[PDB]
Amino acid sequence: SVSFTFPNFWSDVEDSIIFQGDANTTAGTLQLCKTNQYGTPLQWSAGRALYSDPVQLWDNKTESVASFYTEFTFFLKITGNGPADGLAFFLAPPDSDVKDAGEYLGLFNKSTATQPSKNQVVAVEFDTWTNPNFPEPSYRHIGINVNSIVSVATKRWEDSDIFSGKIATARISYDGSAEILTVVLSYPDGSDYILSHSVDMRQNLPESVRVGISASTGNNQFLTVYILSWRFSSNL
Amino acid sequence: SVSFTFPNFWSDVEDSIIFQGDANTTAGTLQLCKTNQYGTPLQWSAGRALYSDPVQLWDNKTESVASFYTEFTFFLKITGNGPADGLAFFLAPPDSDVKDAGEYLGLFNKSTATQPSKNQVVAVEFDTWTNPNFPEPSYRHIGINVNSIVSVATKRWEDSDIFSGKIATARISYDGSAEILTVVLSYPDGSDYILSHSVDMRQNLPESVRVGISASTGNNQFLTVYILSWRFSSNL
Amino acid sequence: SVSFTFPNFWSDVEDSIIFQGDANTTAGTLQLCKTNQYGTPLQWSAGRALYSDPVQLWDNKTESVASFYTEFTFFLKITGNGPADGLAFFLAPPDSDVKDAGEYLGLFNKSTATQPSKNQVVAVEFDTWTNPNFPEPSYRHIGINVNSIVSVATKRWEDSDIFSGKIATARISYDGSAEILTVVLSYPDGSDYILSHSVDMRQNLPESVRVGISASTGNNQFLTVYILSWRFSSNL
Amino acid sequence: SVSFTFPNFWSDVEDSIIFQGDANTTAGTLQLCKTNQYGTPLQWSAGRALYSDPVQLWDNKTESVASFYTEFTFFLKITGNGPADGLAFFLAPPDSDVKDAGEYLGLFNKSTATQPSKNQVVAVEFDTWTNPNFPEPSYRHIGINVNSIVSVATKRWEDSDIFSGKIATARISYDGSAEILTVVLSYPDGSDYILSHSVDMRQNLPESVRVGISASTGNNQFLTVYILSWRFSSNL
Ligand SMILES: *[C@@H]1O[C@H](CO)[C@@H](O[C@@H]2O[C@H](CO)[C@@H](O)[C@H](O)[C@H]2NC(C)=O)[C@H](O)[C@H]1NC(C)=O
Ligand SMILES: *[C@@H]1O[C@H](CO)[C@@H](O[C@@H]2O[C@H](CO)[C@@H](O)[C@H](O)[C@H]2NC(C)=O)[C@H](O)[C@H]1NC(C)=O
Ligand SMILES: *[C@@H]1O[C@H](CO)[C@@H](O[C@@H]2O[C@H](CO)[C@@H](O)[C@H](O)[C@H]2NC(C)=O)[C@H](O)[C@H]1NC(C)=O
Ligand SMILES: *[C@@H]1O[C@H](CO)[C@@H](O[C@@H]2O[C@H](CO)[C@@H](O)[C@H](O)[C@H]2NC(C)=O)[C@H](O)[C@H]1NC(C)=O
Ligand SMILES: CO[C@@H]1O[C@H](CO)[C@H](O)[C@H](O[C@H]2O[C@H](CO)[C@H](O)[C@H](O)[C@H]2O)[C@H]1O
Ligand SMILES: CO[C@@H]1O[C@H](CO)[C@H](O)[C@H](O[C@H]2O[C@H](CO)[C@H](O)[C@H](O)[C@H]2O)[C@H]1O
Ligand SMILES: CO[C@@H]1O[C@H](CO)[C@H](O)[C@H](O[C@H]2O[C@H](CO)[C@H](O)[C@H](O)[C@H]2O)[C@H]1O
Ligand SMILES: CO[C@@H]1O[C@H](CO)[C@H](O)[C@H](O[C@H]2O[C@H](CO)[C@H](O)[C@H](O)[C@H]2O)[C@H]1O
Ligand SMILES: [Ca+2]
Ligand SMILES: [Ca+2]
Ligand SMILES: [Ca+2]
Ligand SMILES: [Ca+2]
Ligand SMILES: [Mn+2]
Ligand SMILES: [Mn+2]
Ligand SMILES: [Mn+2]
Ligand SMILES: [Mn+2]
């Protein structure tokens, strides 16, 4: 059983959050990627914020899988028409470090991003940029990734919400018995996105893992991701 | 596309909410079942609060199913050791009225509660009382009901949370493409319940329906359910 | 050095709040005056909710009036054009009990309401009814009462806010050194009422007092006051 | 009759807020003074954020000082034992620009900071550093400044709250009729600071003024002030 709550990141979350890549706290929020003194986000950057304590995903001698829930708010600071690349919530082995930037969201490497058998990561992505390098929706989208940058299921993410300049609330749940991952993205306006898909953690990740949030950028400099709050709870 | 938000029920929600059975507003909240002048809940009562506007669940000539999300907070005013019977969120034909009280949660009739083919209702229940009349967990529980008072899937609901005297937050989502219903129950302490199950609305409900919240009581008078807030959104 | 916080009144505030007259808790709120089973407020009723623990207002040889701050939210459920009589925050001797209803706000008796030397109560009133019995604004108003139902200072209270059907936030502060009482009434719309006046508690109240909120009604039955939250802190 | 509300500073408040000195927005907040790429605050810096629209303070032949109320939250990011210099809310002529840093809080010049007749500024200061250059409390404090860096009235500000690492809420009100300025500083823990003092804006400021918040630093580099939200309303 694991749980934590960050109403904000004003306190010294140093002894509770592992910062990878560019990740760090900025004025009570988590800023995954670096910006210059002029507030302009740097190109090809990546960062991740992983919770220190590990999570018992499942048991082998019991085959019993754990359930978990996470909720976090984020703001997309967009100053252009081509924001990239987005952010993602994810689970990975405790020693997993930041990977490639750009379309890989700091989760995979260029060489194996499309090879599930060569990865150990499950994530829900909020993709603000359609990439031609591999198969994916031609529109902004939300998706569930199982050991691959190519989502197993996606949902269209409206630009009116992406460029809304409003605080979004992401909720992700997983029922260990049913083996179902669900994501709900909500905007203060009146729009909710719902995406669910069956996924068995036992065949995609080790018994013990860490949870975190990742973000990255490519050539454009029109986007900076900020996480305002974050809580999580898990039960075997 | 349908959506609404009730941060509270202080306003005159008369021209937006259909009250069934005992249901009504009480000091900014929805109180489904009646209590006396001494605050004591009456026995064998039932009540439902349905949103006026109908929701397009699915399309026949398109086979396309809609997705929706709902969130609401509730408080369990318990004054004894045997609180019953609980509450539930549900979807049913627009002309569906309150049914039997007690273990039926105002959703089914005594005679057909266990006969799916004789019902038109999908619900997520928060059952505070184990009934011997039909099969169900011997402990307090949360469940998904598909045209029957006998849940297709359940999750244990800890008494420490039920008798916590705290405001609970219920979240229910449905992905029309994946045909998955998910429920998350959260307590300000640090406990989250997650329950997901595949369910196809097309074979359980008509194209157009109404959403609502229901509650009922039996012989005991140790429980009074109050809904503090409620919002919903749906998209075809 | 006394302080307390009530984010709501869902818990059993029995062993912390002294209920006088009709006062009691109702669905997470404080309802000072009673209503029938039809939700209709009874005529000529009065009620007060005083915090159990007494507050040290001042001292003699020590010479040091205590400072305090209190904040609370309330809703005016109005169903007619003649709401009466309103509510008030007050300080009085620990053994002070509810007084007369109607225009006296449960704070004074009919025979001495206009005689300062015969009373022991300082209060901030939110008067929704202009009375001709004694001098007072011919319009709804907010006021500072020092041992009298006749305010020493008042501020007009716009009807657009009174019948707004929105939750109001009251803030009352007192600087024991400057001997100044300040009241600020705020509405979510965009209106703030400010009223300050010099007042020396030492010559109007005993060294030890209790703080509370009261309300009352007269002939009309168009108003029911509800207090949703309440907090207070003091320092000698 | 001017009013504005900033629940945060995530939006482009460019066409609503005049940034002076180092002031600017940082991740949804206002950062008055600059910090390097290492998050270290620069020495001897100053910045102010004034609301664009001017406020009508008072009139002559009309005789009617306007009343106003303002509320804002701020966080003191402290990394050392000598945080300086603090922040302040103020009113000054519309064309007033940032002044000297250090102990002057960006509000006065070194040569005239102690000369009321040479200044046009009324403010509430939150001084985290006792200066020996001029008379002031030998302990951290809150104060009301009338055309001088030497407060006419002050209140001790406990270090437990200053180094608390929690978000503080400041509330400032002014009754134009009573000519009374009141400040209330509140911490989520359970401490409220109250300070009131008589002040006539008519003899200290022009008929039209601008309101804002300022901050500054000296030699030490242990403090960085952040304003998370800010709202204000006024009425002639
Ligand atoms: C406020 O109302 C409550 C209603 O609950 C009163 O307490 C109840 O009193 C009845 C008997 O009159 C008991 O059967 C209940 O068990 C009590 N309820 C609780 C929660 O204890 C209470 O007396 C009223 N307070 C005042 C001052 O009249
Ligand atoms: C919900 O409760 C309200 C109580 O406010 C009921 O309204 C009252 O109804 C009675 C008759 O039943 C009238 O005499 C009163 O004038 C009504 N009160 C007000 C303020 O108008 C209402 O009937 C209840 N709703 C339902 C569906 O039962
Ligand atoms: C506050 O900082 C912002 C940083 O964004 C400054 O505005 C930027 O100015 C640079 C050039 O110096 C431009 O490339 C950016 O496009 C601007 N950003 C935005 C959002 O417009 C701004 O000048 C600073 N304000 C002050 C008073 O110094
Ligand atoms: C996150 O940002 C902070 C900025 O506050 C970094 O802390 C500074 O690190 C430099 C050296 O890298 C030190 O000289 C400063 O003294 C530090 N500042 C403070 C206030 O202690 C921190 O290094 C960053 N964390 C990571 C993992 O990069
Ligand atoms: C014009 O298309 C761009 O070509 C680049 C090589 O010339 C590169 O493929 C780029 O994609 C990269 O940047 C975008 C936008 O910033 C995004 O971050 C991608 O993930 C990243 O690979 C093409 O857009
Ligand atoms: C002692 O068991 C009770 O027997 C009753 C008949 O004598 C009846 O079955 C009752 O159940 C009813 O009340 C409970 C508790 O209030 C609950 O509401 C059930 O749904 C309702 O059927 C038995 O508990
Ligand atoms: C018909 O008007 C009533 O006259 C009374 C004397 O005959 C008395 O003034 C009464 O006022 C009372 O009711 C109002 C409205 O409820 C209010 O509560 C007053 O405080 C109360 O004295 C008149 O309505
Ligand atoms: C070494 O102490 C410094 O002496 C200065 C004169 O030589 C001056 O008093 C200085 O104070 C300055 O820095 C502090 C801390 O940052 C504060 O900002 C004061 O306002 C500023 O004048 C002393 O630190
Ligand atoms: Ca992409
Ligand atoms: Ca049951
Ligand atoms: Ca009156
Ligand atoms: Ca100083
Ligand atoms: Mn993608
Ligand atoms: Mn059940
Ligand atoms: Mn009055
Ligand atoms: Mn000072």
Nearest to D37 among A27, A37, A226 (CB): A37
Q: Is the peptide bond before A85 cis (omega within 30 degrees of 0)?
A: yes
Buried b / exposed e across B100-139, counting CB within 10 Å, b at 16+? bbbbbbbbbeeebbbebeebebbbbbbbbbebeeeebbee
Amino acid A165 reads G
Both tokens assigned to B167: 């405001």
After which residues are there C–N gaps above 2.5 Å in chain A? none
The response to whether D129 counts as a known ligand-binding position is yes
Nearest to A194 among B69, B184, B198 (CB): B69
C-alpha–C-alpha distance, residues B125 and D92, integer Å: 60
State which H helix or E strand residue D159 sits in: helix D159-162
Long-range pairs of B6-15 with CB within 8 A, sequence gap ≥ 24: B6/B229, B6/B230, B6/B231, B7/B229, B8/B228, B8/B229, B8/C167, B9/B227, B10/C75, B10/C77, B10/C165, B10/C166, B10/C167, B11/C165, B12/C165, B15/B52
Q: Are strands A208-216 and A86-92 parallel, antiparallel or unpaired?
A: antiparallel
Beta bridge partner(s), residue C191: C187
C-alpha–C-alpha distance, residues B141 and B123, integer Å: 14
CB-based contact D104:D145 (threshold 8 Å): no
Q: What is the DSSP string of C159-197?
A: HHHHTS-S-EEEEEEEETTTTEEEEEEEETTTEEEEEEE
Q: Which chains touch D (3 or more CB pairs under 8 A)?
A: A, C
For B40, which DSSP code? P
Nearest to A196 among B171, B175, B192 (CB): B175
Q: What is the DSSP string of chain C?
A: --EEEES-S-S-GGGTEEEEET-EEETTEEE-S-B-TTSPBPSS-EEEEEESS-EE---STT----EEEEEEEEEEEE-SS----EEEEEEE-TT------GGGTTTS-TTTTT-GGG---EEEEEE-S--SSS---SS-EEEEEESSSS-SEEEE--HHHHTS-S-EEEEEEEETTTTEEEEEEEETTTEEEEEEEE--GGGTS-SEEEEEEEEE--S---EEEEEEEEEEEEE-
Both tokens assigned to D7: 């629940």
Resolution of the structure, angstroms: 2.2
Is the Cβ pair D29, A31 closer than 8 Å? no
Amino acid D189 reads D
Three-state SS at B169: strand
Is the Cβ pair C165, B77 closer than 8 Å? no
CB-based contact C127:C141 (threshold 8 Å): yes
Q: How many CA atoms lie within 13 A of C227 on its CB side?
A: 28
CB-based contact A218:A204 (threshold 8 Å): no
Both tokens assigned to D235: 């009425």
CB-based contact C47:C32 (threshold 8 Å): yes
Termini Cα distance of chain A: 6
C-alpha–C-alpha distance, residues D170 and B152, integer Å: 53
The experimental method, as deposited, was: X-ray
Question: Tokens 């992406």 belong to which residue?
Answer: A162
Find the largest Cα–Cα distance for chain A: 54
Q: Is the peptide bond before C85 cis (omega within 30 degrees of 0)?
A: yes
Both tokens assigned to A119: 């990865």
Residue B41 is part of which domain span? 1-236
The structural domain count of chain A equals: 1
CA distance A171 to chain B (A): 10
C-alpha–C-alpha distance, residues B215 and B87, integer Å: 4
State which H helix or E strand residue D160 sits in: helix D159-162
CB-based contact C89:C170 (threshold 8 Å): yes
Ligand 6 atom 20, closest CA: B103
Q: Is the peptide bond before C59 cis (omega within 30 degrees of 0)?
A: no
Q: What is the CA radius of gyration of chain D?
A: 16
C-alpha–C-alpha distance, residues C12 and D147, integer Å: 51
φ and ψ at residue B102, rounded to 5 degrees = 60, -140
C-alpha–C-alpha distance, residues D102 and D86, integer Å: 9
3-state SS string for chain A? CEEEEECCCCCCHHHCEEEEECCEEECCEEECCCECCCCCECCCCEEEEEECCCEECECCCCCCECEEEEEEEEEEEECCCCCCCEEEEEEECCCCCCCCCHHHCCCCCCCCCCCHHHCCCEEEEEECCCCCCCCCCCCCEEEEEECCCCCCEEEECCHHHHCCCCCEEEEEEEECCCCEEEEEEEECCCEEEEEEEECCHHHCCCCEEEEEEEEECCCCCCEEEEEEEEEEEEEC
Is the Cβ pair B194, A67 closer than 8 Å? yes
B125 lines ligand 6 (CB under 6 A): no
Is the Cβ pair C29, B28 closer than 8 Å? yes
Please classify residue B76 by burial: count the beta carbons closer than 10 Å to its beta carbon, then call 0-12 exposed, 13-18 middle and 19+ buried.
Answer: buried
C-alpha–C-alpha distance, residues D208 and C77, integer Å: 40
Q: Is the peptide bond before A159 cis (omega within 30 degrees of 0)?
A: no
C-alpha–C-alpha distance, residues B6 and B87, integer Å: 18
For B65, which DSSP code? B
Q: Which atom of ligand 7 is nearest to the CA of C221?
A: 16
C-alpha–C-alpha distance, residues B2 and C41, integer Å: 36
Contacts of B12 in chain C (CB under 8 A): 165
Question: Tokens 């206009």 belong to which residue?
Answer: C114
CATH number at residue D191: 2.60.120.200
State which H helix or E strand residue D128 sits in: none
Q: Which of B3, B70, B160, B173 to mutate to test the interface with A (most CBs of A within 10 A)?
A: B173
Selection from A209, A175, A178 nearest residue A66 by Cα: A175
Beta bridge partner(s), residue A168: A74
Dihedral (CA of D7, D12, D13, D18) sign: positive
Residues 6 or more apart in contact with residue B147 via CB below 8 angstroms: B116, B117, B119, B120, B121, B122, B204
A39 lines ligand 3 (CB under 6 A): yes
C-alpha–C-alpha distance, residues C186 and D125, integer Å: 24
CB-based contact A18:A50 (threshold 8 Å): yes
Q: What's the gap between Cα A147 and its chain centre? A: 13
Q: How many CB atoms lie within 10 A of CB A59?
A: 13
